[PDB]
Symmetry: D3
């Protein structure tokens, strides 16, 4: 089975401050959603992430990641991620999950 | 079967004005292509969209969507989408279609 | 089998100057990696590219491509690609490869 | 999808006389069932037949066929088939259907 | 994944007497093996049975079944089965297991 | 891909004498065909054999095998096989080949 979805992170005011894991980045924020597959897999599927909606402040550098932390048979943790003075007004991440 | 392609939307001068479906957005334009699978499916495939070419005006906010309206067994309607004063000089959307 | 990976291109100082293949573009640079599938295919798989990390200079236009040159049963050549005065500080391309 | 089933033809007293299509065979009888897949295919699946229950008269030659006439996306016509003076007391045909 | 194997039941002297579950059959014997898939499934696969070696006494009726009791994600119970005065000197059952 | 076919061995007069590989069998004959897949595989497929047509002399013991020697990506050697005084007038072996 193959499943797909869409993660609307929205404004980064609702995103949480998280502690940087890259020493050259600070003020790292992150909308980290925790997804559950409608129809579970029993072996962890391969997941691809895609950014398909961006609304970023022009006066300041575009800093975004569509981050993919982990993948289990039941679901996956992924996030919209930005850092420093960059301002995200909108970020969506559509994704896919395939067996093997 | 799995099929893939690429939608080159180009300059947004050729994109059409379309009526906003989000009340906080205006001047919504859209290059909405209508794709047909080379080898048809008989059940609608799962489609993922990806943005893989961006050329956007720096003086004004990055506003883009790789929108996916609908998916049939024969094809799918999807679009490059921008709004307000944002200026897109170039947007490509490469995509994939898998069975299930 | 389905395989996935991630290409971190990094700063465009390490990207090479390459000769433009589009007459309206100049100063075309490119981090062109050459990937090898862990478990080979015997027929060329369908590959999708996705941009999942961008860090671009705000004072100058966003110009990027996640380019996909060729796909063999053994691997594929793809690249982060920018042109003119645009400055990329960071670009990642996560990808997927499926049979057929 | 893959589907399987089982056709119990039973005693050949209930099998019909049918006209021989092989000139070296006569008294050709046949229990010809007409199967319908639970979950339809949209392209005709590959079907394999197997004989998995035989109960044949010892005094006379073993003459049986697990015949596979046709395969559609909706189902298939197949039959237990015997000829001449052979006496079948019992014949089952378990089968399988796979996509492609 | 698809797995296959082969069950050599051998002479029916080693087959066990089992109590008939069909009132018109007696002296029912059965070589009932209990198979384990090399690489487990997590949903029960579709299994087909095939008889591919028979060595039966000519003086007495051919009575055999390639019986398929149950199928789990881990394996399946199946058997060579004969009844009454029939004498099996040799019966093999080759089988296949496919996902879905 | 999945492929299927059918091997009609016919009368055992055309079958060759071959040297027994089982010390308890003699006068071993064999119609050993050498099959080639229409659309090659690049890894050896799993093959199942099935006997689906038998026409055997009643006065003498039923001795048959649907033998499967080897499987390559290009095809497979399999055979109708009988031994001792058994007389086969007709044996067909329908088969299937699936990827993995
Ligand atoms: C190019 C550069 O290093 N500019 C610094 C700026 O660094 C921040 O922005 C750059 C690229 O725009 C990278 O994203 C860095 O990761 C990021 N650093 C941090 C700690 O977030 C800052 O150092 C800024 C404030 O000192 O000075 C700029 O000139
Ligand atoms: C942050 C904000 O609301 N700025 C407004 C601007 O809103 C437009 O741009 C923002 C983010 O850049 C969103 O994309 C909105 O969807 C968009 N609104 C519309 C109607 O297109 C405009 O309201 C602008 C003109 O009044 O004022 C800015 O300050
Ligand atoms: C909109 C435009 O053509 N501006 C030109 C600029 O063209 C460059 O940037 C645009 C969009 O930002 C395209 O990406 C072009 O491909 C790119 N051209 C080249 C040759 O790289 C330059 O021509 C610039 C210098 O003459 O003038 C701008 O006004
Ligand atoms: C060996 C033979 O031809 N015996 C014939 C018998 O033929 C019948 O049985 C054989 C094998 O057992 C084949 O199955 C033939 O297809 C079948 N023929 C028919 C018409 O059904 C009969 O011809 C029989 C009656 O004349 O004579 C036997 O000796
Ligand atoms: C044709 C028939 O019923 N013959 C009976 C025989 O029945 C046995 O064999 C037949 C077919 O060969 C079926 O397999 C039956 O299932 C089987 N019955 C049993 C109880 O095993 C016996 O009844 C036999 C002894 O009374 O008489 C034959 O004539
Ligand atoms: C039951 C038995 O061993 N009978 C023998 C017979 O053996 C042949 O037939 C049996 C079963 O019907 C097996 O198929 C053996 O494999 C087969 N042996 C050979 C060498 O082909 C013969 O030994 C026969 C001639 O001596 O005597 C029977 O009683
Ligand atoms: C979902 O995300 C949170 C935030 O990181 C994490 O701590 C939690 O364990 C996750 N929940 C699940 C379903 O695993
Ligand atoms: C393709 O797109 C247009 C524009 O929205 C739509 O109206 C039309 O029905 C579509 N054509 C097909 C092939 O369905
Ligand atoms: C990898 O990329 C380089 C740069 O274009 C190319 O010339 C080379 O042939 C490629 N190597 C492989 C493994 O094909
Ligand atoms: C089923 O079998 C009969 C007997 O041959 C045939 O005539 C009929 O058309 C079949 N029905 C279907 C469902 O096609
Ligand atoms: C295998 O077969 C025996 C005999 O019927 C059965 O009782 C036993 O539970 C089976 N073992 C497994 C692995 O389930
Ligand atoms: C086919 O069968 C013959 C007989 O055993 C064998 O010797 C030969 O090598 C086979 N041919 C192919 C195509 O491998």
């Amino acid at each position: 089975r193959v499943q797909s979805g869409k993660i609307n992170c929205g404004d980064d005011a609702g995103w949480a401050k998280v502690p940087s894991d890259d020493p050259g980045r600070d003020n790292t924020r992150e909308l980290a959603k925790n997804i559950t597959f409608a129809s579970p897999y029993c072996r962890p599927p391969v997941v691809l992430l895609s950014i398909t909606q961006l609304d970023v402040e022009q006066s300041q550098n575009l800093r975004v990641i569509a981050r993919l932390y982990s993948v289990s048979p039941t679901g996956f943790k992924a996030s919209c991620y930005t850092w420093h003075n960059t301002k995200v007004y909108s970020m969506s991440i559509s994704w896919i999950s395939i067996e093997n």
